[PDB]
Subunit: 193 residues, 7 copies
Amino acid sequence: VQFLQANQESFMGICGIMALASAQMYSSFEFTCPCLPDYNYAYGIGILIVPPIWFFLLGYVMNNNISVLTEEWKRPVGKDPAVLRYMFSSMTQRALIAPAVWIAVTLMDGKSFLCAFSPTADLSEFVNESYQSLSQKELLKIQAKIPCKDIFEEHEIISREAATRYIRCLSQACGWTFLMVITLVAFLVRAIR
Amino acid sequence: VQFLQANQESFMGICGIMALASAQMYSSFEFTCPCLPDYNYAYGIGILIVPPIWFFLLGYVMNNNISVLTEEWKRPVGKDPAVLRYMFSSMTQRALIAPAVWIAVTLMDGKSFLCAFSPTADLSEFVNESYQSLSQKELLKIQAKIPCKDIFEEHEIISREAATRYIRCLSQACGWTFLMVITLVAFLVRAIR
Amino acid sequence: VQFLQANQESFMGICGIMALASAQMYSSFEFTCPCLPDYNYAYGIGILIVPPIWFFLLGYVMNNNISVLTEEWKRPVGKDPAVLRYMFSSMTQRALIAPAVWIAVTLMDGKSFLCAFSPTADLSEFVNESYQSLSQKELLKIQAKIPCKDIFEEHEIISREAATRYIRCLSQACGWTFLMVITLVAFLVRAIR
Amino acid sequence: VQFLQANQESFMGICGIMALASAQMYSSFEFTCPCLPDYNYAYGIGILIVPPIWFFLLGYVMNNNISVLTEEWKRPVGKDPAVLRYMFSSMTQRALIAPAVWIAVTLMDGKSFLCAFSPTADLSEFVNESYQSLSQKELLKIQAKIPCKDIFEEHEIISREAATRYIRCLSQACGWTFLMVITLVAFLVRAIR
Amino acid sequence: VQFLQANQESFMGICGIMALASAQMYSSFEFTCPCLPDYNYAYGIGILIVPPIWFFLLGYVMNNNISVLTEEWKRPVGKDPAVLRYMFSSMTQRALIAPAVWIAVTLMDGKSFLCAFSPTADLSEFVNESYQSLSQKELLKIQAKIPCKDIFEEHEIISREAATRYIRCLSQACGWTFLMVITLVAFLVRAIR
Amino acid sequence: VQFLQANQESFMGICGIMALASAQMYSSFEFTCPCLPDYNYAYGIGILIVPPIWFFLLGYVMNNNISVLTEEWKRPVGKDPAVLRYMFSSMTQRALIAPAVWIAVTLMDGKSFLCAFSPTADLSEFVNESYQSLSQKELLKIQAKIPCKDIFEEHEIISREAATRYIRCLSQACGWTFLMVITLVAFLVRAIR
Amino acid sequence: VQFLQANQESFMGICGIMALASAQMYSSFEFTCPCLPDYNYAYGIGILIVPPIWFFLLGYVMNNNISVLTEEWKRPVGKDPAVLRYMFSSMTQRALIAPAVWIAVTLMDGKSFLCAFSPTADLSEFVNESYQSLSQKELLKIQAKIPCKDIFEEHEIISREAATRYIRCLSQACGWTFLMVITLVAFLVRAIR
Ligand SMILES: *[C@@H]1O[C@H](CO)[C@@H](O)[C@H](O)[C@H]1NC(C)=O
Ligand SMILES: *[C@@H]1O[C@H](CO)[C@@H](O)[C@H](O)[C@H]1NC(C)=O
Ligand SMILES: *[C@@H]1O[C@H](CO)[C@@H](O)[C@H](O)[C@H]1NC(C)=O
Ligand SMILES: *[C@@H]1O[C@H](CO)[C@@H](O)[C@H](O)[C@H]1NC(C)=O
Ligand SMILES: *[C@@H]1O[C@H](CO)[C@@H](O)[C@H](O)[C@H]1NC(C)=O
Ligand SMILES: *[C@@H]1O[C@H](CO)[C@@H](O)[C@H](O)[C@H]1NC(C)=O
Ligand SMILES: *[C@@H]1O[C@H](CO)[C@@H](O)[C@H](O)[C@H]1NC(C)=O
């Protein structure tokens, strides 16, 4: 939370104020994995996918030049040819910021990955040597409870903390690759056009 | 609480100051489920319904142009035809902000859902296999105590934490659908009129 | 306490500065129920009643136009007829704010209700089935100790937490009804006069 | 401590800055009852009495018009008759603020009352039924240790927490009566002169 | 620490900024009594005596008019007779502030008194009745360890907390007498010269 | 986190604002060593290497003179000869700040060193005397779990805390050498060119 | 950390901003004694010696008049004779501030002394009476672990807390002597030149 208060007053700005808004909203959001073999994937991917869509729509709405764009696109011939495209692309670029920040933040803190890819993941290195031959339905039901400290009661079968750290490392690697690709794309866009 | 201090000074504004007011008021509100089979639904739905109504009335009151609206609507013919409707609709739109923020915040933190829909919910996956045949009145009385950590003393029958996470996920899904529908409506309103 | 720091700088104001003053004073006030069958009601109703009276007097005192009102009311004929009534009613309205805030805050946090109406309340649903036939003097003395966690040592007779939550819900319902009635009255006053 | 930071910037002032100074000084003062039958009363009454005297002297000193008052009172005839009395009374009134704040704060938090009036108080309702006949010297020595959690080791004789709450309620009642009388006096002074 | 942040911005000042500097420096200073019969007195009196001397020297150094004073005192006859004495006395008075604040703060928090006067103090009321006849060298070595919670392991001989509270009360009494005498002297100085 | 809030407002700046950005980002980054003999080195070196590369790219992007550099380098002959090189080198120098801050901070807090060089390190002084003759594959697998408090369960073989402190000291030595070399290079650059 | 935030805004300054920088950097630095008989002295003296050297170099670099000094010292005859020496000495004096602050802070908090002089110190008063005759190599290895709470497991031989307090007192005495000598030197410099 201190990171938001620090990065504040930097723009001082409406463009770079939704970024800290999304970051702080994630910081004050109670992630709760259902820890069920059926609804884990859905919940994880939903937390990963839906809030950025909503932030996109919100950034499109809060821009004071949607009215003019609608008025011009509505006429068969509006009062120029492509200053409209300019402000439209500027609006889209300004809007695309907060979704990227949300996705980066939720990837660096690998809760959604841990909640989503836990039941199906291949954890054969962490499963105990005694219970190394059992129905994968049992392993599904057990591994589903890994992101839940309070519900997991199968310490004699799978080390919970080892698998947690493994999947969190995977999630952080993915987040860093995402950040690098995004920054390269921004570099090309600013250096070409 | 840090989210409110961060989002402050953004408008700097009386319109976008009731939003943080309602958010902070929820943050500093001691939600207390009665954990009784009779008054759970009432308390949950009341916390969900009444404070937004009060915020609506308050936002209507704090606007300095209710006096002029009353004076004009009181005359059979006032000193124009529809600049009154304009300021009235502006007042209503400004007022409708804080109820939406309250409902969104109280849905993302699924306490009201957990308090309200716990006694009647169908929790057959979490009920123990031994006590899978008993009077639904007993299950009513037991499930009523799920939102109360201090009162629940039936660990041999129902896993409390699993059901809590389940209902909290449901509540968060509902909150996200609410936010998306609200944002789409705002988008249409700003893009048409 | 963060709510006061957030709502600060909003008026920026002497009128809307006693509200946060009373709220913060309640936040930093050590409520201590005597937990005796004789002095519970007195203490609860006193905490509910006296501080708003004091805030009323204080708001009357801190207004710089009591001297002029006294000087005019003292003369048999003062130097107009009813600009005095105007400033007097404005002073009274400005003063009536902080008592309302104090009463609302102390009702939402149902300590005074829990301290006051505990010894006399009808708690027959929470009393154990074994001790369901005993002198109501015994129940008086026992229920008096409900708001005190450190003094209550009768867990085999009455569930303390259940009764606490029950009475806190009642208090919050009363507080919400109070807020709604107050806001309706303010609405009528602003819309008529 | 948050109350001081909140009430700050309100005057923005040298008059209403010693009030928060005294309040904060009490907040950051380590009250330590000696818990001995001989020095309890002395310590309690001293903490109640001496700091307000010191604040009075300090408020008299920090006012830049003591030099002129001394120079005029020193002459047999000074260069008017009673503008001196005016500034003297203004200085005295400005000085009398911080002692009142200190006394109110130290009364609302009933430590000085608990430390002072504990050894001599009549606690016959809290003394156990077994030890209801013993030399009042023993009760003196025992009750002296009531404000000390770490020293009290006579739980089989007197309930410490009950007596603590009782005396704290008495102290808060006294503090509220003090505040009411002070505010009434200020009201009369402002409404008459 | 909140007291310093509160008293800040009051002067807004270089004179009244060393006071909060010394107070905060004491607040962030790790007092560590050696708890040995030989070096307790030395450490206590040193913490009481040396830092105020250093603050005196520092306040003398940070004043931009020592160069002129040296240049004038160096000449046999400088370019007036006693405007030098005026600025010298003003410098000395400005410098004497921080030592007083340090001494007051370190007296109100009776650590230095507890560390210094513990081995030699007469604690015959707290010593157990069994060990009331033993070589005062043993009592010296034992009482030396009173300010150290981690080292004291003689609970069967002397109550540590009782003696701690006793000596802390003595220290606070001394601190209050010091503050009163200082304020009286300042009053006389401002009212005479 | 307080260090960032303190060093803020110092530049008041876009150049010296990415430094605190990177420092705060490290402060709010959840380092999680996988504690596996295969992926420890990779994770440690990645955390050490990749974020500074990303900060370099970001500092290159956020500078408003990449467009002009591209436009000039694109032409066979641009509209001078080497004012381009000047602004290019200034941009590169401004960009190189945040990577250095990240590397210094992550070296002073020896987590990456502890995670990376733990499985291969030579810890023969800390290994117990009983298990001083065993397959280095066993020691590899065991030492891999040293940075994980929750996973390490081999206290009868290797002291975890001793090895942790050893490797953290090594990391801090490396960080200090890095800082010294960087500062010497900056000194030469500023004193020559 | 609050001391830095308090002493901030005092200069408001680039000269007196490195002082708080070094103080805060020490506050947010994880001191970790290796607790080995060979590398304790090295680590302690290094933490005491190297960071002030780096702060000296940094303060020399951040001053905007090293370029002019180099340009003038480079010529056989520069465009006056000794205004160069003036700005050079001013730069050196401004640079010497932060090393002094670092050394003072690290001496008042006697970790470096405790880490460095623990293995070689003469602790014959704290060593148990049973183990008062043993090879000083054993005492070396044991005393090396005194600054480490988690590693020290020889409570039957040496009291760890007593020796810790002893060495911390020694370190604080040294720090106070350092501060006094530094202030006297500054006094002489300001009063003579
Ligand atoms: C594996 O299972 C055995 C029981 O067969 C148990 O004793 C052992 O502690 C388990 N180990 C792990 C790492 O789960
Ligand atoms: C279910 O009930 C049995 C008793 O028949 C008990 O042993 C078991 O622990 C219970 N399990 C759960 C998950 O409630
Ligand atoms: C009720 O009293 C019985 C003793 O007759 C006791 O065993 C039981 O735990 C009590 N239950 C409650 C809810 O107080
Ligand atoms: C009163 O004393 C008796 C011993 O006679 C003891 O058993 C009981 O717990 C005591 N009760 C209280 C409230 O002190
Ligand atoms: C005093 O010493 C006796 C042993 O003779 C011990 O039983 C008792 O607890 C001690 N009391 C105190 C207050 O030290
Ligand atoms: C070393 O191993 C032995 C068992 O042979 C055990 O008793 C001892 O505690 C161990 N010591 C350490 C420091 O690991
Ligand atoms: C000293 O060693 C003896 C064993 O000979 C032990 O009983 C005693 O507790 C030890 N005391 C200290 C202070 O180390």
